[PDB]
Design a protein around this ligand. Structure first.
Ligand SMILES: O=c1ccn([C@@H]2O[C@H](COP(=O)(O)OP(=O)(O)O)[C@@H](O)[C@H]2O)c(=O)[nH]1
Ligand SMILES: [Ca+2]
Length: 456
């Protein structure tokens, strides 16, 4: 099977004078990945108001625009005129169709796969290009979509008759254009997580659930890698605490003076070792099992910093913050809420071990993301981690009651710090993540899925 992929990105790649979105830095990693595969050429196109298509290579082109790239939530997509939008999309359409003829003439062969990067406009374009490719007697080429999210929260506010999100597009991609109302336009769709798999499935239900999948699991080794010369302070010293709106800093005992909203941690270099959690504040992450376990080790007078990354509903955020400080006496355990992935790579890079004691973690990307920067991982014998965590990169605790897990986590962090798993396993954690869950393997799994699940 020989692949001639044309991929339509939604954001700008990393470059001179431009950092990348998330969906952009990915398109880029994927572009390299797919091209590195035997029997595979992928051509990408993707917009910027800074960067210019290259002169010394043809694998990609830039869609040069004067304004910043639109957004779904600086330029908003509803904020621009109707005439602004139509053009922005019909200009892009012409660039893509030129590019495609360039490619198809180049290779003496028809493109046999279209990627399109959010659920908005990029699919409509490729879907329109495809109708016309049939107008001339040349097969339409199967089109797969990446549902990262941003364009669906747009569709949800339109439906939720939210403020700045009047109803313009949702009933258009649906009633007027008919993109996800059958397999006649979009052959398949990849979500990153079952949250997104459902967010989409409710929105476009005449789209077969059999044709909405989860991307084969990888991590983005461009982002997640051993970050050179990172410090404690460089990586998270200037990260302000989170907690919750209404956090009464005044009930904190004295020893807990260190805790306070929108206030960085004092004296990062003062703590002997660092221990990291990262994940949505779901109940099954068993955040509570960590704090329980950190409560037992802060009293051991070894200076163990404990960081609690991730985002949570103001109810559940208040739950664990108050469980941590009021209920357990946690003075060396700060909540810094959610963080970008690159900031997180800096954090992992300087962390001694990470603990993600999820019950039935479906796959757990934070496990391999953290390994991809050279630090070991501790988790539980349930779910996705049973298949790739081993004694060489960390540990999985025997499953049990939350209090049971927490005692076992405590046992784990204590051994990991004491045997310096960072030094003794950090090397293999890195070479292991990069080998088995690089964008290169995820690309290979993905094209392979697409062949047998989306070629009707
Ligand atoms: O503060 C955070 C926490 C998580 N993530 C990302 O969220 C994704 C999902 O991991 P999580 O544990 O939140 O949930 P999952 O879908 O793995 O159950 C991973 O790509 C993480 O790097 C992130 O970008 N920032
Ligand atoms: Ca989307």
């Amino acid at each position: 099977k020989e692949w001639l992929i044309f991929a339509l990105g939604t954001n700008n790649w990393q470059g001179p004078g431009q950092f990348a979105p998330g969906s952009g830095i990915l398109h880029q990693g994927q572009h390299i990945a797919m091209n590195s595969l035997e029997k595979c050429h992928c051509y990408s196109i993707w917009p910027s108001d800074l960067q210019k298509t290259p002169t010394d290579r043809d694998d990609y082109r830039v869609y040069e625009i004067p304004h910043p790239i639109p957004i779904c939530e600086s330029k908003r997509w509803h904020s621009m005129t109707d005439e602004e939008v139509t053009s922005y999309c019909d200009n892009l359409l012409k660039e893509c169709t030129d590019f495609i003829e360039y490619i198809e003439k180049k290779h003496g062969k028809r493109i046999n796969l279209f990627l399109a990067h959010h659920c908005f406009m990029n699919p409509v374009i490729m879907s329109e290009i495809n109708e016309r490719r049939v107008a001339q007697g040349i097969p339409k080429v199967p089109l797969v979509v990446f549902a990262h999210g941003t364009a669906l929260k747009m569709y949800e506010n339109e439906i939720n008759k939210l403020p700045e999100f009047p109803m313009k597009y949702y009933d258009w991609i649906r009633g007027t254009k008919n993109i996800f109302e059958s397999t006649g336009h979009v052959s398949g769709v990849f979500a990153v997580s079952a949250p997104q798999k459902n967010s989409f499935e409710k929105l476009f239900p005449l789209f077969p659930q059999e044709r909405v999948a989860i991307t084969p699991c990888g991590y983005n080794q461009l982002v997640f890698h051993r970050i050179q010369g990172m410090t404690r302070e460089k990586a998270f010293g200037h990260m302000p605490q989170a907690l919750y709106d209404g956090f009464d800093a005044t009930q904190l005992s004295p020893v807990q003076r260190h805790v306070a909203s929108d206030q960085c941690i004092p004296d990062v270099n003062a703590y002997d070792r660092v221990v990291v959690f990262c994940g949505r504040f779901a109940h099954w992450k068993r955040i509570d099992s960590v704090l329980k376990a950190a409560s037992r080790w802060e009293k051991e007078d070894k200076r163990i910093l404990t960081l609690i990354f991730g985002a949570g509903s103001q109810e559940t955020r208040k739950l664990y913050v108050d469980m941590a400080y009021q209920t357990l006496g946690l003075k060396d355990t700060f909540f810094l809420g959610p963080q970008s992935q690159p900031d997180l790579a800096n954090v992992y890079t300087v962390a001694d071990v990470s603990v993600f004691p999820s019950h039935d973690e479906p796959f757990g990307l934070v496990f391999i993301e953290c390994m991809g920067c050279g630090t070991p991982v501790i988790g539980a014998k349930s779910g996705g981690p049973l298949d790739f965590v081993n004694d060489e990169v960390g540990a999985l605790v025997d499953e049990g009651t939350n209090d049971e897990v927490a005692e076992r986590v405590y046992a784990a962090v204590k051994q990991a710090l004491a045997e310096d798993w960072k030094k003794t396993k950090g090397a293999q954690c890195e070479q292991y993540a990069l080998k088995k869950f690089s964008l290169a393997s995820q690309a290979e799994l993905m094209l392979e899925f697409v062949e047998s699940h989306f070629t009707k």
